[PDB]
From a paper:
Here we show that substitution of a surface residue (F306C) at the entrance of the channel of CuNiR results in an altered second sphere coordination of the active site Cu. Comparison of the crystallographic structures of the ‘as isolated’ (1.7 Å resolution) and substrate bound (1.75 Å resolution), allowed us to assess the effect of this substitution on the substrate access channel and its associated water network. Access to the active site from bulk solvent was also improved, as illustrated by the ability of nitrite to diffuse into the T2Cu active site in the crystal despite polyethylene glycol molecule (PEG) (present as a component of the crystallization medium) being bound across the mouth of the substrate channel. Previously, we have shown that the T2 site is not accessible to nitrite in crystals of wild-type AxNiR where PEG effectively blocks the channel. The binding of nitrite to the T2Cu results in Met135 adopting largely an ‘open’ conformation across the substrate access channel, suggesting a communication linkage between the substrate-bound T2Cu and the distant Met135. In fact, this change has been observed in the wild-type AxNiR enzyme and several other CuNiRs upon nitrite binding but its significance had remained unnoticed. The effects of surface residue substitution, F306, described here produce sufficient flexibility to allow increased solvent/substrate access, illustrated by the presence of a second water molecule (W2) in the active site pocket and also improved access to nitrite since binding is not prevented by PEG bound at the channel’s entrance. However, the substitution of F306 resulted in an approximately fourfold increase in specific activity and had a marked effect on the apparent KM for nitrite, which with a value of 1.2±0.1 mM is some 50-fold weaker than for wild-type AxNiR. The apparent affinity for nitrite obtained from the laser flash-photolysis data (Ks=0.8±0.1 mM) is in the same range as the apparent KM value obtained from the steady-state activity (KM=1.2±0.1 mM).
Numbering used by the authors:
A (entry chain A), B (entry chain A), C (entry chain A): 2 to 336
The structure:
């Protein structure tokens, strides 16, 4: 019985961080309490000033990542402030019943609700808004994130051997559908509701205008690059709630990857590129062996390099000449 | 030798049902006899009256599902009535040789042919029409279905433990390419042959106008929803003969999934969303734990919700508060 | 230490062949030396005379396949002749560090460089050009190929049993983005640099104009069909450096397939259709059981049959009536 159990309250953090948590744990099941507040807002999504009439959990794209253990109960208070215009709810793919919790969390502006469900299945799972009759629009406008349910005894390799990460990052990839006017410039809308009709028309073409990590072209670059150091193992959580993507770490690999994102299945090793089905979250472990600036991108290189689906990881440490060595630098072709 | 074996005749049923059959079986190999009759016809595919000049096996999209066991021989009589206009044939992906049987089953209107092949490989396999020089058109116009070849000892989990379904449903997902006229309205054609040229032009854009389960937007909804009850295990066969899709059961999971559809491989568990490669059939088992109306859809939510790739499953039984509970219903945000 | 090891020089061959090599080997690690020379050139890519301002490794699309064993070191001399116009480099997905070697191999026309890296991970891996700020264009214009790193003890099935191929073929699949002028005809450009701007615009639509194996519609057909005979096992290496594809052998199967392409993972068996993520190379084994002309294609049948992603394999040997038999040839429907 769930009412029997100890409760615990978690404080969420903004992507690309993930809130402090234990992997393998000696603790027994808890009721883990979270709160998220919906925020609609206009966001600038590229370096040319294009804006999106966006919708978010907790003010970020993606929403924050929620972490529990298998056998825990997730208890979410979802708040829809009166400063928003639309009704919202939440569908946890990690949950069983009631359209993922959507039927039990319909919240008009000025309302809130509390849902509990048992996290009985391990993996990274998408959660997203799913209001009746306007599902894709809320999703593509930014309302998704990841619930990670860790096995109580931590991650395992195909032979049952223990795996771990030293640091976790969460990347949400968003296919955006920004309309254009007769002058071929992207439209800027005064309200969310005004964007709707034109946006549906772009959606129906199936061609995103932009595809971005974490809300903006260049979100995970420069000062906001991810960081690591040689010897450290990183977990890269990648969610795409609406469209397929193909993550790749340039100069690296997926050492162990659950591309379907479900930790009771054996991971695959040595991946160059993996696949996140639209409507899922996946997870890759990599232990850094070389220092330098890596790119982490969607390996449809048009989607990455023209449309925005690419970030950076800056990795400290000592170069390893056994792994790779410039034998002869660029120099004239001798004749 | 195949001429040695007992024959048996199977009566096919219309999707989304699958004809009566045994899973694990003590019977030895049989020659399993089927017949299908091709039917070209105009079909209404959406709620706005749009029509498709369609082509079908047995009058339905998809064609009916054929079920045998590994080691059986499939023996198909394919009939192309003189009331049709085009030549047809059939390519079984479950078969070895002769372009899947296409080279041996070329049938002009008024002809028929009988093919036999050995079902030596277990899984769900696409079959489709493949007339020389007009393959994609026949496929996208509706000519595909699934052959399911069960292992003689039934389905197995990754550890070799037995799995079963209590009920099987078959869903064919069809990317349709319906042309539009200068007024932006979909074209209605008096004959199949008249649709061809304009349809090729839409196909070459790679953008479907509609994407539908089982022939029509809303095919598997309302009175035609799929049904189950709590405690029952269902097999959801999903075929897509031309384009990738990503099945998802909202409020449920794929308990055991063979997304590539081949039962000698271990299934994956706990999937939120799986992937059916264009040109394949996949299969998922789920045991219902909560009652209610579920959506089964392609989790590109534009393809599902705007373009049509979505159906419903109405599930009887008792709600389970341990799995999920509304702790606090939607209600004003206290201040 | 790598400087300790014996060196060996490999002579490359043009696709669809793969250079002579050993699978399981008693030899210890070597430094394997290769050379490739970049060639920019206009190529005719279809039967209607359309041209592409192409970029290639070694004059072919794809580049040639390089084969080593796990634990070897690849040592590549990359040469960019002064007759080319653009700078180039190379990113080996099989390598660790420095953006796959791209940062250490930047070569302007008239220069060359030599890179070494350790092939410490088994599988087929894409390599491609990745010049800063123009990555997708170089890739989609033809600059990719496969590095195959075999396990030292050869390929293995899921139970550790030995697998082999008798013959290997390499297929690169290229999504091309050829611009059109106001008359709706494809543009022919006098130089590579002149194609750039218009090509970017087509790329951003995400809709290829052509999708081809090995550089041209029909590249692997007629006199250039692949060949096999009944009883022979073939390895079909399939690379796609930019876009997803779904290989299928019509009338055959993937007997053992590593669709993610990484040989330390167990292969899947009996596949009808497999999936190569954009940015990866995959590998399938098939042992031929029937003679005849097979099609090997991308099973989005529009991409294959309208856009070009399809070739042929002509297989010698004796027909097998147990596997498949025409019981009754096409003939009038009796009444
Ligand atoms: O690995 N280059 O995208
Ligand atoms: O799980 N919602 O599509
Ligand atoms: O298997 N026919 O494409
Ligand atoms: Cu919402
Ligand atoms: Cu969902
Ligand atoms: Cu047909
Ligand atoms: Cu086929
Ligand atoms: Cu280049
Ligand atoms: Cu790459
Ligand atoms: Zn309690
Ligand atoms: Zn916990
Ligand atoms: Zn809508
Ligand atoms: Zn560590
Ligand atoms: Zn880029
Ligand atoms: Zn960058
Ligand atoms: Zn007989
Ligand atoms: Zn049987
Ligand atoms: Zn055609
Ligand atoms: Zn049962
Ligand atoms: Zn929907
Ligand atoms: Zn519905
Ligand atoms: Zn040396
Ligand atoms: Zn070697
Ligand atoms: Zn560019
Ligand atoms: Zn052999
Ligand atoms: Zn074709
Ligand atoms: Zn052909």
């Amino acid at each position: 019985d769930a009412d029997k159990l100890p409760h615990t309250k978690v404080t969420l953090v903004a992507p690309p961080q993930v809130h402090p948590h234990e992997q393998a744990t000696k603790s027994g099941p808890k009721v883990v309490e979270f709160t998220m507040t919906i925020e609609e807002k206009k966001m600038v999504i590229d370096d040319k000033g294009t804006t999106l009439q966006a919708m978010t959990f907790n003010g970020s794209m993606p929403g924050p990542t929620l972490v529990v253990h298998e056998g825990d109960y997730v208890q979410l208070t979802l708040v829809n402030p009166a400063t928003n215009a639309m009704p919202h709810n939440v569908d946890f793919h990690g949950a069983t019943g009631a359209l993922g919790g959507a039927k039990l969390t319909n919240v008009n502006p000025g309302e809130q609700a509390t849902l509990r469900f048992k996290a009985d299945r391990s993996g990274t799972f998408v959660y997203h808004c799913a209001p009746e009759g306007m599902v894709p629009w809320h999703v593509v406008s930014g309302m998704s994130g990841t619930l990670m349910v860790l096995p109580r005894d931590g991650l395992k390799d195909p032979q049952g051997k223990p795996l771990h990460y030293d640091r976790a990052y969460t990347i949400g990839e968003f296919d955006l559908y920004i309309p254009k006017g007769p002058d071929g410039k992207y439209k800027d809308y005064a309200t969310l509701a005004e964007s709707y009709g034109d946006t549906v028309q772009v959606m129906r073409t199936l061609t995103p205008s932009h595809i971005v990590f974490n809300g903006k072209v260049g979100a995970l670059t420069g000062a906001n690059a991810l960081t690591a150091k040689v010897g450290e193992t990183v977990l890269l959580i990648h969610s795409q709630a609406n469209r397929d993507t193909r993550p790749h770490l340039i100069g690296g690999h997926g050492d162990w990857v659950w591309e379907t994102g479900k930790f009771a299945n054996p991971p695959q090793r040595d991946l160059e590129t993996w696949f996140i089905r639209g409507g899922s979250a996946g997870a890759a472990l990599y232990t850094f062996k070389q220092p330098g600036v890596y790119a982490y991108l969607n390996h449809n290189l048009i989607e990455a390099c023209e449309l925005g689906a690419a970030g950076h990881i800056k990795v400290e440490g000592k170069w390893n000449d056994d792994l790779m060595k410039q034998i002869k630098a660029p120099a004239p072709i001798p004749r």
